[PDB]
Every structure is written in structure tokens, then in C-alpha cells.
Amino acid sequence: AFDGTWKVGGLKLTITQEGNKFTVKESSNFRNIDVVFELGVDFAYSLADGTELTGTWTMEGNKLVGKFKRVDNGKELIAVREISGNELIQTYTYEGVEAKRIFKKE
């Protein structure tokens, strides 16, 4: 069950779901921000009053895949990741470059 903390010491991360409604609590570097998404639903949101991404997020039991558009940069920033063992990685793919930070279940 995802309702748990998955992060590396110093940072914190927490997922929680009311039935099917997944919210992610991200604290890294120097900002804590939550992102809520429904399985296979499209939604637009502004993160930290800067990234305004409109996209649909699909979750497979151990697969997180979507596509989001951020006009205030390059109209395409996507997060895609699968869950391996007990850990969570997070990839931000913009234009055609993948950058990912590594985390694990707390």
C-alpha cells in the first residue's frame, strides 16, 4: 500500500490514497509540495507558482506514467517511473532529456 513515506534522510515523501486518489508529498532541497492525481485522469496545476502542467497521469500497480505540458518553459515536462522492490525513483523528462532522483521506502 502506497500510503507511506518513501524518501532519503533529510527529505520527506509521503503517498496516500482515499480509495483511488493518489497524493504525493514531496520535500526536497528546500520546498515541500503535494501533488494529487487520479488514476488515468487529466488535470492542470501550478507548482510553486511557476510550473503549470496540464496532463493525464496513469497508474499501473507498479507503473507511473503520464504526460504534462508546461507552457512557461517548453510545453512538455513529464514524470514517469515504475516501482522496484521498496523504493521510488522520480524521472522528469523535458523535451528529450531524462533526469531522475533516487529515493527508497523509509
Residue 70 is assigned to a ligand binding site: no
Experimental approach taken: NMR
Instruction: Domain ranges for the chain, please list them.
Output: 1-106
Angle of CA points 98, 51, 88, to nearest 5°: 45
* 51 three-class SS: strand
Residue 81 is assigned to a ligand binding site: yes
CA 99 to each of CA 17, 24, 61, 94, 106: distance values in angstroms, whole numbers, following the listed order = 26, 19, 23, 8, 22
CATH code for the part of the protein at 1-106:
2.40.128.20
